[PDB]
Structure 1
Amino acid sequence: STKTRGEVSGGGRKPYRQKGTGRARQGSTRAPQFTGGGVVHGPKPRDYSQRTPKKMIAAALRGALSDRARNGRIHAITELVEGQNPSTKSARAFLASLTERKQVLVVIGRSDEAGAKSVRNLPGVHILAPDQLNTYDVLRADDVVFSVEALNAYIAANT
């Protein structure tokens, strides 16, 4: 946001008349060039988003995933829990033993028992459900982790 002429209080007075003053053509005290003045062509609060084709989004996403698969960066898992309760410790040991990398993207689904709990507090680790699978995360993370259920729904959705 910003603030310009008309939003600033005052400035409608026109002192220092136009002859016999030895002064400038003032016209207002809140004009840009005076301190305490308004902003010219300032940062109006733009709400913007580059609306794109669904075809472009889908092609980019499957493209990046195909690059990770070609590079051997896919880690398909079945689950992640010591039965029921979460364990940051256990997931850390498992993932550090498997991927050996910093930045990890995890896809589980709507399963909060340990899938969406053990992965927290892990610098560089993000987790999401397939329907929210963007490309920025995928391109950032190298060793991409997928659940079986994630692949089942995702693949079925994409035939």
Structure 2
Amino acid sequence: NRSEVRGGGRKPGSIRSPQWRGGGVVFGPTPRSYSYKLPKKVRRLAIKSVLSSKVIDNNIIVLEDLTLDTAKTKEMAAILKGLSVEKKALIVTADANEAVALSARNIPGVTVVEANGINVLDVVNHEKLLITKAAVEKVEEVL
């Protein structure tokens, strides 16, 4: 600022002014934070809608139980080959399947999501969604 600059008080008006090169900036951005909020009614009526874009273009793909045995990332590349999904994707599983979460984190395109932690963003970016059917019954209960 002009005041928190290690500057002089005497006339050389002052050696650390707005026009002076040795001084700081007049205005300038200060320690602030912008955190607004929608209503609760407008926070659960959109997660359906981005889901609703996906039922249109068959971007939803539903699987049963997300069958895994270990943490082999070679299996998931065969699974992405099996479901023929190419770019970024989603995985939603209701019970935090640890073989799923420990796998696929290194595969660059994909991500796994515990079913309560869905949000309006990752449905838009990852643009297709491998869902276990066991998680589908949960998501109507919260919304």
What TM bracket, shorter-length normalisation?
A: 0.7 to 0.9
Cα deviation digits, residues 13-64 of structure 1 (max 9, x gap):
222xxxxxxxxxxx11111221121112111122112311222221111011
Q: Which residue of 2 aligns with 1:34?
A: 20
SS in structure 1 of the partner of residue 45 of structure 2: helix
Of residues 46, 54, 71 in structure 1, which corresponds to 2:32? 46
Q: Which residue of 1 aligns with 2:45?
A: 59
SS in structure 2 of the partner of residue 52 of structure 1: coil
Instruction: Find the aligned partners of 1:82 and 1:91 in 2 and give their Cα distance.
Output: 9
TM-score between the two structures when normalised by the length of structure 1: 0.79
Q: Which residue of 1 aligns with 2:93?
A: 108
> After alignment, is 60-69 or 124-133 more displaced?
124-133
Which residue type is aligned with residue 7 of structure 2? G
Query: Structure 1 101/53 Cα, relative in aligned 2: closer, same or farther at 3 Å?
Result: farther
SS in structure 2 of the partner of residue 123 of structure 1: coil
TM-score between the two structures when normalised by the length of structure 2: 0.87
Q: Which residue of 2 aligns with 1:12?
A: 9
Stretches of structure 1 lacking an aligned partner (at least 5 in a row): 16-26
Instruction: Give the 4+ runs in structure 1 shifted more than 4 A.
Output: none
Max Rg structure:
1
**CA RMSD of superposed structures (Å):** 1.8
How many residue pairs end up in the alignment?
143
1:120 aligns with 2:105: yes
Query: Structure 1 62/82 Cα, relative in aligned 2: closer, same or farther at 3 Å?
Result: closer
Stretches of structure 2 lacking an aligned partner (at least 5 in a row): none
